[PDB]
Design a protein around this ligand. Structure first.
Ligand SMILES: NC(=O)c1ccc[n+]([C@@H]2O[C@H](COP(=O)([O-])OP(=O)(O)OC[C@H]3O[C@@H](n4cnc5c(N)ncnc54)[C@H](O)[C@@H]3O)[C@@H](O)[C@H]2O)c1
Ligand SMILES: NC(=O)c1ccc[n+]([C@@H]2O[C@H](COP(=O)([O-])OP(=O)(O)OC[C@H]3O[C@@H](n4cnc5c(N)ncnc54)[C@H](O)[C@@H]3O)[C@@H](O)[C@H]2O)c1
Ligand SMILES: CC(=O)N[C@H]1[C@@H](OP(=O)(O)OP(=O)(O)OC[C@H]2O[C@@H](n3ccc(=O)[nH]c3=O)[C@H](O)[C@@H]2O)O[C@H](CO)[C@@H](O)[C@@H]1O
Ligand SMILES: CC(=O)N[C@H]1[C@@H](OP(=O)(O)OP(=O)(O)OC[C@H]2O[C@@H](n3ccc(=O)[nH]c3=O)[C@H](O)[C@@H]2O)O[C@H](CO)[C@@H](O)[C@@H]1O
Lengths: 343, 335
């Protein structure tokens, strides 16, 4: 038996990773306070897991709840921990920074302490390409200068530094930091997917709601950038590909862990795609038309960001297999099948 | 006028509490006593003279939200001076989570309790360590910031937290004070304290045989490291000025950062010579290579602090060594 602890597994990226984990034969324990997710996402993952659905156990616990967390760790043998949990809305983080510093930092510090006290010192952390700030060049390698422009991005960069300091003090720690780029899409079944609250802030969940008629038009944030068509360019990666990156991270920690301490890997496709190109791909995949409103640049937006995949391909032995066309297909499938989410 | 002082039983905190007690403030100190004795605040109450009755102490950890909420509901604080936290750099590298927990989680809880109680006026004890190895000197508040150890990272992260908090809530008035190198003690010799001058003192009395000079080939005038050493009583006065600035000229304050230094740079050998004159003892030396992570030369740009904060250091190197020797001679085994 191989058991994995997954914080925030009820959420968007976590649920898709939990499903892949169950299909690989892992036992999965999820810890999630359901603050930005519902039980339904986990129940449907259990259903998609077929026979392996019973290998998923859900604990409705906050990572800051130290006693509830010790109970879980002292009553389990965890091979590793995948740490998805945290708040992630950039706008909300600027307006309520203490909420973000509290939930993300105190939750992570508590988790790391409970892990070290219960002999589990293998960790995979959800970092983000936001730590590259506004990069001076592309593609972004893992050695690019790091910075943060908002409280949310600050919590990611600080947790990274905490993980590096922790390994520096204790060589028994094996930590892989995964800098996600822009995940889009859903499981190709259309049964699970991203279910954002309120008005979505990311591009593709917004275009999604325009396509099903819930919102009237997409607002394009700035057209005067130095890109092909003036819109921002991003590295869009299929969420299923992001999930498989975590499987490859566990395989790295399980088979070739003597040569790692606290490592960082990009999880991207290496291809840059503009806003209009994504809208064009979603119109082709869905047959719907996305009305456009043109506005100025969004404060804090980068111009062009995509990943240098060489390091992940070499050390993790991992490369994304889904392209833009499949991402929009699977997003539309989840969208048309579940236009109002899990509710 | 009541002021909450976290970490007020410590080195810099006790001296600030004494200066506050002499200025006529009621002072409530919160300190878990994990790195300080209660005898320090007992002696401070003595030196406060007729004002000793204004000091109130609570042995409370900042992470204890329930206890911390009760103290804030018991008084109406004008502002909070935040000294509390761990500061041993070597203890930050070997035990980083202990530092990230105590400093960050303690500070987060305090800022939240402050906001809920309505006391959004903060003076935070930062450090010139955030200037890393400066490319030029003197170091202004605009210099690029970076941390080189877990302790320094907690200092820089707390500064950014205060930056973000004020940005989200204009009712907040925050002053960040970057200390430099504290030296000395209250001139009475009654209170005081990993650093050069405490190491020099142990060599003077004989607890240690010699002082290792870490690096002799620096691009300085005598080849040894240069720092901005500031009297701890001057540091205490800098916080009185920070409260004066918050209480008077406050409408143009958001999250202001002020250096607290003398503006003068003194080498290692110059401090050894200064302490030998004030103590009469001799300091045998052993010259060694550069210590890893050590800045070459660092000292403060004091122009911003002299104008807007209306503060300037009063004490020089000679008096620092005199008060340090005075306190350590009369109390060789501490409190
Ligand atoms: N979503 C993205 O586009 C993206 C890209 C880069 C990085 N990331 C990071 O990847 C991770 C996963 O993102 P996501 O899209 O799945 O987000 P999500 O909000 O869908 O999932 C995060 C989950 O964590 C849970 N959670 C939050 N605080 C918790 C706490 N204190 N204790 C327990 N559970 C808690 C939430 O309830 C939620 O279910 C996050 O850490 C995010 O910051 C996100
Ligand atoms: N420079 C900064 O100035 C500050 C003080 O400098 P110093 O020379 O006086 O060191 P110091 O150790 O003498 O002062 C720190 C004091 O805070 C207390 N402390 C630690 N954690 C605490 C917590 N959760 N709650 C309440 N009190 C706590 C300690 O007991 C100590 O009395 C430090 O933050 C240092 O980094
Ligand atoms: C500043 C900011 O919020 N950055 C976050 C976001 O931005 P990031 O810009 O990377 O991603 P978004 O999905 O928010 O935006 C993608 C692109 O589409 C454009 N766009 C987006 C939404 C919309 O309604 N209209 C529109 O035109 C943007 O200008 C951008 O060029 O990416 C990640 C989310 O997964 C986070 O790690 C980043 O912190
Ligand atoms: C690694 C470390 O501890 N950093 C702390 C230290 O740095 P900082 O170097 O500024 O102060 P130190 O007391 O450690 O020594 C200052 C100077 O004396 C020299 N020296 C010191 C001791 C010795 O035994 N021999 C010798 O030659 C140093 O090289 C340096 O040039 O003082 C500050 C006190 O406020 C703290 O903020 C810093 O976090």
């Amino acid at each position: 038996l191989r058991t994995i602890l997954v914080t925030g597994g009820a959420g968007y990226i976590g649920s898709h990773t939990v499903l892949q984990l169950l299909q690989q034969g892992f036992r999965v324990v999820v810890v999630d306070n359901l603050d930005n997710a519902s039980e339904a996402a986990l129940a449907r993952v259990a259903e998609l897991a077929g026979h392996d659905g019973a290998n998923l156990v859900f604990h409705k616990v906050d990572l800051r709840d130290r006693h509830a967390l010790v109970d879980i760790f002292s009553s389990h043998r965890f091979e590793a921990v995948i740490h998805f949990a945290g708040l992630k809305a950039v706008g909300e983080s600027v307006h309520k920074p203490l909420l973000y510093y509290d939930n993300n930092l105190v939750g992570t510090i508590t988790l790391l302490e409970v892990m070290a006290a219960n002999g589990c010192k293998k960790l995979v952390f959800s970092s983000s390409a936001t730590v590259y700030g506004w990069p001076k060049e592309v593609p972004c390698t893992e050695e690019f200068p790091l910075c943060a422009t908002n409280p949310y991005g600050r919590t990611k960069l600080v947790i990274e530094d905490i993980c590096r300091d922790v390994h520096r003090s204790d060589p028994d720690w094996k930590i892989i930091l995964l800098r996600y780029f822009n995940p889009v899409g859903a499981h190709p079944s259309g049964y699970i997917g991203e279910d954002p609250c309120g008005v979505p802030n990311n591009l593709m969940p917004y275009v999604q709601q325009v396509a099903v008629g819930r919102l009237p038009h997409l607002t394009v944030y700035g057209t005067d950038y130095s890109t092909k068509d003036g819109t921002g360019v991003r590295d869009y990666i299929h969420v299923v590909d992001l999930a498989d990156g975590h499987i490859a991270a566990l395989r790295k920690l399980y088979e070739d862990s003597d040569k790692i301490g606290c490592e960082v890997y990009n999880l991207g496709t290496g291809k840059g795609t503009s806003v209009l190109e994504m809208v064009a791909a979603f119109e082709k995949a869905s047959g719907k038309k996305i009305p456009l409103v043109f506005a100025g640049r969004r404060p804090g937006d980068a111009e062009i960001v995509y990943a240098a995949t060489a390091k992940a391909e070499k050390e993790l032995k991992w490369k994304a297999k889904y392209g833009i066309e499949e991402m929009c297909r699977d997003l539309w499938n989840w969208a048309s099948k579940n236009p109002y989410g899990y509710a």
